[PDB]
């Protein structure tokens, strides 16, 4: 029974998958940098003195990982990384205990789609008693089990020698990651996203001096694509977190800069027939239809009027009648209705299959039937793509995940180029048509259980919806027993309430989380996750009404 | 900012395509050189109908009327009544709604009033037996066109109610790589404000052409008389070749003018239906536009449709070019492995369109 699940489609490519994104998140000073150094040494036998931005490393014959250190002091970085992180190494200071950033990050992950979470405890050598060490491990493990799941693996790191952790448990951690498998998540399998691997400005220096630095820039972004394939044609709308929405000016695939050993062996095998680390930051009718210069009538004749006319063109009545004095030339289409007996039996079974074969044309569980239809369909996707030519393939499906691609954007704000920190990730996310539209969003929202204070109507709230983070003024409402939408003054203490706000639209059922403060200055000590909820409906208008009483004597 | 188009060509397709995509479009130079330039009255009314069935859409038409700006909103549907000008029949306005109806926030319940038939536009029986059956293959389980009153030209007076109960996230992915074995020939012969003798004479004429065949021929006789028969005398026939095997249907239709011989029209329509079957592989030319559009807006998947070389005509190319301009999707054609015939497989990768208007 526990084997059954909701059927889902995993868009991960069958060949050459992208490197898995590993986000090392934890409070400041917990040991994020050293853990990355300890791991990369094991997998590649080389020590990186300095790490900045994503680092792609080979982990096996056909497996690659991209390590990214989340800035501990930024909540925005915690939000967007939570959306794209395939695996999260949650760093916990064992001696001190859990922290807001740990609790805050998990809650963001829970609401935005849980990725694999692995707890890593550090500074355990600071303990002076073995008894208290064991007790502390027991308490942290159980609390960690409540957040993620019972029996979740939690690794223990004692101390740091030469800026490296002990070899033995790094082996345990390395093996655990290698055999890990990842669930198919709704959001990551329905939108294309890419983590920027390196950053470059293409603007001509002459333009910078003639007009001044204030001029908008042209920027190129290199990285690995993930999730659904990105369409090849330019003009696609994408959102860069913390920057805004842009259109893909140019896009072209590049050779993979960090090929996996299996890939290189096959490529070298191709040569016969006729490096482990990469951290830069640190007249065929089909063609005739699609040359617009040739007129359609010109196209037709070379290889051989309007849709207002629903009735198709026909030849004159007399010529058609002569053409069809006899019924021949279609008799195959119609049903027909000592040695010849076999010939009749040949004809008859054919007739039977047409008439009744389909009612007759098994898997044990209904779950398997759904999976088979998906898998059968995914097989059909692959087969024709293998028939497909590489160039025509890229034109149809676009750039598949795992492809290392250069993307060029116009009119990027200059402050992005100037105030560029390699530590902070740059996340590019594709946008569906509904994401572009702006309007009223109706959602079911509840105050977060750990947030001290209740929210207020017409009170600014930073919502994290899809790839985008923005501030709006929600209005919390009630159904009044499904009679009218009545404005509430505050959110309910311990239950949900309908909330309406203006902002970018999204598909219904899209989860989101809310925060009132994102700046470090106003962080204080309380929990910063303010609200959680699900978008229920998208519209252009709403009829919230408030109670008004007239008083007399 | 705006994807631009020229002329009145494929107006309904372009507006409908824009509505599904959500991408704003501009249509310019509409009949610039004609004595009466700009937008026609019926094709105004279509813009009114589009406005009624959606919310948030902005439609601007130029002062001279030769340019149109359309910024689509969401499809919401609802219950409404539309008065169709005599210049076009109801089938002109119903047909675009077949694209849009299943993807609405609320069920489409539109009552159309006006002429119900013409020589150039889809008839009632073409829609009932010829076009919706294609949608039902794509996952529109519940759809119906109720003929409350027939109206023949020129005075019309007919009344038809369109109801589309089925609301779906997106069309299913089609897989049709064979020639459907069409099993029987059915149809409806109808007449208004005239003697039944005409309808019988037409069934005779169609039967004469179709008697040599190896399948059933059963043509319904639907004689309309009295108050609900409209204001003008009229008569027409629709013959449908049905494949019960995969529920595919091939149809031809025409109507008669005053003084035309009923037998001849029956002979012609039966002959025309015979043309369509020869020229078709999986769907008819008059049904192909719906099939291609539905496949484009399916899940991010490739649907395979078999199409005969005869179907690759002027209309098919301009249709595909319009699709690429709006959706950037490319239709790929490959030869079939068989040598007996010359058909092609049309493979179209879906865009992953979904119904976000519907409340959950």
């Amino acid at each position: 029974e526990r084997k059954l699940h909701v059927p889902m489609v995993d868009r991960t490519p069958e060949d050459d998958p992208p490197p898995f994104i590993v986000a090392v998140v934890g409070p400041p000073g917990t040991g994020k940098t050293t853990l990355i150094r300890s791991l990369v040494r094991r997998m590649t036998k080389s020590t990186l003195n300095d790490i900045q931005g994503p680092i792609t490393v080979v982990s096996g014959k056909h497996r690659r990982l991209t390590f990214l250190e989340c800035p501990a002091d930024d909540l925005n970085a915690m939000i967007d990384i939570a959306k794209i992180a395939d695996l999260v190494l949650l760093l916990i200071d064992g001696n001190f205990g859990f922290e807001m950033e740990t609790m805050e990050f998990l809650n963001i992950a829970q609401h935005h789609g849980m990725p694999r979470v692995l707890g890593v405890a550090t500074h355990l050598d600071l303990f002076k008693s073995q008894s208290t060490l064991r007790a502390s491990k027991k308490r942290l493990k159980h609390r960690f089990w409540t957040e993620v799941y019972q029996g979740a693996k939690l690794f223990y790191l004692s101390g740091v020698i030469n800026g490296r952790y002990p070899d033995r448990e790094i082996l345990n951690l390395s093996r655990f990651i290698s055999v890990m498998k990842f669930r198919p998540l709704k959001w990551r399998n329905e939108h294309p996203y890419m983590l920027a691997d390196r950053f470059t400005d293409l603007t001509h220096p002459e333009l910078i001096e003639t007009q001044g630095l204030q001029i908008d820039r042209k920027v190129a972004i290199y990285g690995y694509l993930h999730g659904t394939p990105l369409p090849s044609a330019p003009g696609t709308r994408v959102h860069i977190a913390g920057v805004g929405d842009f259109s893909v000016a140019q896009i072209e695939k590049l050779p993979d800069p960090c090929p996996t050993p299996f890939y290189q062996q096959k490529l070298d095998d191709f040569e016969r027939e006729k490096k482990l680390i990469y951290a830069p930051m640190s007249w065929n009718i089909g063609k005739l239809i699609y040359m617009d210069n040739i007129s359609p009538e010109e196209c037709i004749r070379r290889w051989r009027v309007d849709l207002e006319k629903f009735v198709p063109y026909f030849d004159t009545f007399e010529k058609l009648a002569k053409k069809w004095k006899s019924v021949d030339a279609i008799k195959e289409r119609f049903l027909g209705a000592r040695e010849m007996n076999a010939a009749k039996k040949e004809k008859l079974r054919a007739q039977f299959e047409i008439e009744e074969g389909e009612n007759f044309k098994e898997y044990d569980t209904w779950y398997e039937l759904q999976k088979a239809k998906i898998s059968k369909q995914l097989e059909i996707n692959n087969i024709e793509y293998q028939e497909m030519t590489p160039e025509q393939r890229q034109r149809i499906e676009g750039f598949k995940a795992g492809s290392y691609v250069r993307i060029v954007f116009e009119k990027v704000p200059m402050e992005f180029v100037k105030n560029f920190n390699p530590k902070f990730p740059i996340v590019m996310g594709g946008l569906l048509p509904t994401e572009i539209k702006f309007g009223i969003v109706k959602a079911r929202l509840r105050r977060h259980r750990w947030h001290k204070k209740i929210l207020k109507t017409n009170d600014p709230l930073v919502l994290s919806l899809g790839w985008r983070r923005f501030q709006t003024l929600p209005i919390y409402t009630t159904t009044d027993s499904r009679t009218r939408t009545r404005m509430l003054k505050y959110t309910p203490e311990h239950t949900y309430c309908n909330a309406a706000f203006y902002g970018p639209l999204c598909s219904p059922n899209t989860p989101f989380c809310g925060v009132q403060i994102v700046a470090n200055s106003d962080t204080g000590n309380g929990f910063r996750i303010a609200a959680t909820g699900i978008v229920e409906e998208i519209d252009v208008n709403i009829e919230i009404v408030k109670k008004l009483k007239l008083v007399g004597f | 900012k705006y994807t631009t188009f020229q002329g009145s060509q494929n107006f309904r397709l372009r507006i409908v395509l824009a509505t599904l995509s959500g991408k704003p479009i501009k249509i310019e130079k509409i009949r610039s050189g004609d004595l009466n330039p700009g937008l026609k009255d019926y094709e105004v009314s279509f813009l009114r109908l589009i406005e009624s069935v959606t919310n948030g859409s902005v439609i601007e038409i130029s002062y001279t009327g030769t340019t149109v700006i359309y910024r689509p909103g969401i499809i919401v549907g609802g219950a409404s009544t539309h008065i169709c000008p005599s210049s076009k029949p109801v089938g002109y306005f119903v047909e675009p709604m077949l694209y849009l109806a299943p993807f609405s926030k609320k069920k489409f319940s539109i009552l159309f009033k006006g002429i119900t038939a013409s020589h150039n536009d889809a008839g009632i029986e073409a829609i009932k037996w010829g076009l919706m059956p294609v949608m039902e293959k794509f996952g529109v389980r519940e759809c119906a066109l109720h003929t409350l009153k027939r109206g023949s030209p020129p005075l019309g007076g007919g009344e038809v109610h369109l109801v589309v109960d089925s609301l779906i996230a997106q069309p299913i992915t089609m897989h049709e790589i064979d020639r459907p074995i069409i099993s029987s020939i059915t149809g409806v012969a109808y007449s208004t404000r005239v003697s039944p003798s005409l309808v019988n004479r037409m069934i005779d004429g169609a039967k004469k052409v179709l008697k040599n065949l190896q399948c059933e021929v059963n043509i319904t006789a639907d004689v309309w008389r009295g108050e609900n028969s409209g204001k003008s005398p009229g008569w027409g026939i629709t013959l449908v070749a049905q494949s019960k095997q995969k529920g595919w249907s091939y149809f031809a239709e025409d109507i008669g003018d005053a003084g035309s011989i009923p037998e001849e029209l029956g002979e012609k329509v039966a002959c025309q239906l015979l043309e369509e079957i020869s020229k078709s592989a999986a769907v008819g030319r008059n049904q192909l536009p719906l099939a291609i559009v539905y496949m484009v807006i399916g899940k991010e998947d490739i649907g395979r449709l078999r199409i005969n070389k005869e179907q690759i005509d002027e209309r098919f190319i301009i249709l595909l070019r319009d699709i690429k301009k709006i959706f950037n999707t490319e239709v790929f054609l490959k030869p079939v492995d068989e040598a007996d015939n010359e058909d092609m497989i049309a493979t179209i990768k879906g865009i992953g369109f979904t119904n976000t208007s519907k409340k959950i």
Binding site: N541 | R48, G56, V58, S62, G73
Partner: peptide
Amino acid sequence: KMMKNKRGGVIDKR
């Protein structure tokens, strides 16, 4: 009743 739940509209300048 028609204007209650509408935001757009057709802008005819002719």
